[PDB]
Design an enzyme around this catalytic site. Structure first.
Site, PDB file in Angstrom:
ATOM      1  N   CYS A   1       0.714  -1.447   0.064  1.00  0.00           N
ATOM      2  CA  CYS A   1       0.081   0.005  -0.187  1.00  0.00           C
ATOM      3  C   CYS A   1       0.963   1.220   0.132  1.00  0.00           C
ATOM      4  O   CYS A   1       0.620   2.272  -0.635  1.00  0.00           O
ATOM      5  CB  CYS A   1      -1.024   0.131   1.535  1.00  0.00           C
ATOM      6  SG  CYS A   1      -0.312  -0.207   2.660  1.00  0.00           S
TER       7      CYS A   1
ATOM      8  N   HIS B   1      -3.218   6.902   4.473  1.00  0.00           N
ATOM      9  CA  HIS B   1      -2.025   6.766   4.689  1.00  0.00           C
ATOM     10  C   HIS B   1      -1.220   8.235   4.434  1.00  0.00           C
ATOM     11  O   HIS B   1      -1.600   8.797   3.251  1.00  0.00           O
ATOM     12  CB  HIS B   1      -0.946   5.683   4.057  1.00  0.00           C
ATOM     13  CG  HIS B   1      -1.144   4.504   4.465  1.00  0.00           C
ATOM     14  ND1 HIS B   1      -1.934   4.155   5.841  1.00  0.00           N
ATOM     15  CD2 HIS B   1      -1.237   3.249   4.045  1.00  0.00           C
ATOM     16  CE1 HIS B   1      -2.204   3.062   6.258  1.00  0.00           C
ATOM     17  NE2 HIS B   1      -1.732   2.051   4.843  1.00  0.00           N
TER      18      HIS B   1
END
Ligand code: A2P
Ligand code: A2P
Lengths: 335, 335
Positions: free
Chosen positions: B128, B240
């Site tokens: 990710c 994130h």
């Protein structure tokens, strides 16, 4: 010693009262000052109660040996002449004088001797995140000169004072209650978020907080080191955390850095990966040390070292450092 | 196109269903697979209901064109031969095959053409945080080769799955009501804290998450770039954030970088300091782009550039990237 606290009402002012008692600082008289807002308020210190006086341009500082000031740069600029009028040493937590050549900018573990010469009878307490960083950098610098630093900060709500702390906690209440988060002290909602802006922007698109880590570090370390910081506000209560990459003139292995940290004043080495031992703000809160861990070689630079560190912004990042400046001067017979 | 989702019950499998619908992926048949735990479960897709089958070592994938897999590394190892037995293309979100040189590791904006050659009929979806980084790095790489990266990550609770997001939310409530925080899916309390460990440690004292950013970036970018990461868990829900310092072979000024980001596929430029416009995870949630801002020159290195970026870990960091790999192939006539 006769001692003043200027700006006693807020988080740092209250920590001054705690630290001065915890450390048995030698006090024969205590004088509390504030704006008209805290004038008349009552505080207890070591069994006696004290009443706050409004800071006025008068002779209230006659006979006071040290004034610990945590009242904002506007107050320190406007009232420096008052506080120092009768020879009081002003130890100023504000940003007002940090760039003045005739006013020392001091972290006792790094450059305590700078405190001994103060032509204006002012000494400047550095920026909270800078204090944290240079306490960790000093033992490395003594192994090999540090040329460059990259630092990402994770700064607590406390950096915006008590009102910043209060905004965060209330947002927590409004979220668990399905309510509307209230936004005011921060530019955006802080709960469940990160704000990559601390203080106002400058003309190179770094913020003033990021430029403090650049400019103040050079003064404190008497160094040409260049620090590039990204400063981010995070939903943490009152300890700051820093991800740091340092580049030195020769390679420092983690084992050598570890040895240096374990002997360094003001540092607590907390670095045991296999036991999940590493600095965290929740556990560095209300502690004195700069806590250092996650030490490893820099995969990107053979001359680089990487680590992570945490410190309590109200203690070592402010009140504790200022009291340590005063303690350093006492140990040198300055008074 | 007949499509399988392997591991449909979890956050990533649910996001496949959402993305495939939102993007009008061309589907003639949908086949959902899980463990015995989700066998028999019903899911709705575009107005029809589908019943999950237990994944078994059989001929279930005969006739299936693409299988989107997010069922864990061990499941992908155990069942890759089953999934690919009849020519199905397995696009795998697990870590299992990320380092196998005959399995392409693809972010379509960066190395989409690598997906055209898949001798094991497997293509790996990268980590990710790596996807997010290389989407931003590519427009810079195209101007000047990137030698080194320092990256601090601020990684959301959803990195530990829906139960990780669940723990964060419940803690918010417990702390609201003044209860003891439930600590289970993270190593320590995450609310009001930061945990500087994502995934287990390795022999060089970087974690597996940090080493994925090191190793996967090299493969995706066909590059000798060295990335040094500090990966930190933060109390954010599902986007994130990354603070990045990039060093190139020649200087790239901020306005040159801004212009590159402005035309870069998969990137949203969000960088207006005078308007307090910058990427923030609260506002990057459930969005598609890698949002990039805080672009500035590196005060520590004339060949350095600094910026900040945000992306949703379940979208571009997982299911969206995987669907985009399939879309890339379709546009090239692959099917
Ligand atoms: N004009 C002033 N003179 C003295 N203290 C001041 C003045 N203005 C503000 N202060 C003090 O500075 C501190 C600022 O708090 P913080 O730094 O945590 O944001 C407070 O203690 C505040 O006291 P007061 O309560 O009297 O306003
Ligand atoms: N042996 C298995 N075969 C197929 N799917 C599996 C297997 N083990 C786990 N999974 C699936 O892995 C997915 C991802 O896990 P998570 O997102 O929860 O971390 C879940 O959908 C789970 O489905 P299941 O619900 O049937 O156990």
């Amino acid at each position: 010693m006769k001692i003043a606290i200027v700006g006693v009402s807020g988080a740092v002012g209250q920590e001054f009262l705690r630290v001065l008692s915890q450390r048995d600082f030698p006090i024969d008289g205590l004088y509390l000052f504030g704006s008209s807002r805290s004038a008349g308020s009552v505080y207890s210190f070591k069994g006696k109660e004290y009443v706050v006086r409004e800071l006025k341009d008068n002779d209230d500082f006659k006979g006071i040996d040290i004034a610990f000031c945590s009242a904002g740069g506007d107050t320190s600029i406007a009232f420096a002449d008052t506080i120092t009028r009768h020879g009081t040493l002003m130890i100023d937590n504000s940003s007002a004088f940090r760039m003045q050549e005739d006013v020392p900018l001091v972290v006792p573990e790094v450059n305590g001797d700078d405190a001994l010469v103060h032509p204006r009878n002012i000494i400047s307490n550095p920026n909270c995140t800078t204090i944290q960083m240079v306490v960790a950098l000093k033992p490395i610098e003594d192994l090999s000169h540090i040329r460059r630093v990259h630092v990402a900060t994770y700064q607590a709500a406390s950096g915006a004072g008590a009102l910043g702390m209060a905004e965060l906690v209330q947002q927590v209440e409004e979220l668990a209650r399905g309510e509307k988060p209230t936004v005011d002290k921060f530019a955006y909602q802080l709960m469940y978020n990160l704000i990559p802006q601390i203080d106002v922007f400058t003309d190179n698109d770094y913020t003033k907080e990021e430029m403090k880590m650049y400019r103040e570090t050079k003064r404190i370390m008497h160094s040409d080191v260049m620090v590039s910081a990204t400063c981010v506000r995070v939903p943490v209560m009152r300890a700051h955390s820093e991800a740091i990459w340092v580049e030195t003139e020769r390679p420092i292995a983690p084992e050598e850095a570890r040895a240096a940290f374990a002997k360094a004043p003001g540092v607590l080495l907390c670095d045991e990966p296999s036991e999940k031992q590493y600095p965290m703000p929740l556990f560095g809160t209300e502690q004195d040390p700069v806590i250092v861990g996650r030490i490893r070689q820099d995969l990107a630079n053979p001359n680089g070292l990487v680590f992570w560190c945490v410190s309590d912004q109200i203690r070592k990042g402010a009140a504790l450092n200022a009291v340590q400046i005063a303690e350093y001067l006492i140990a040198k017979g300055h008074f």
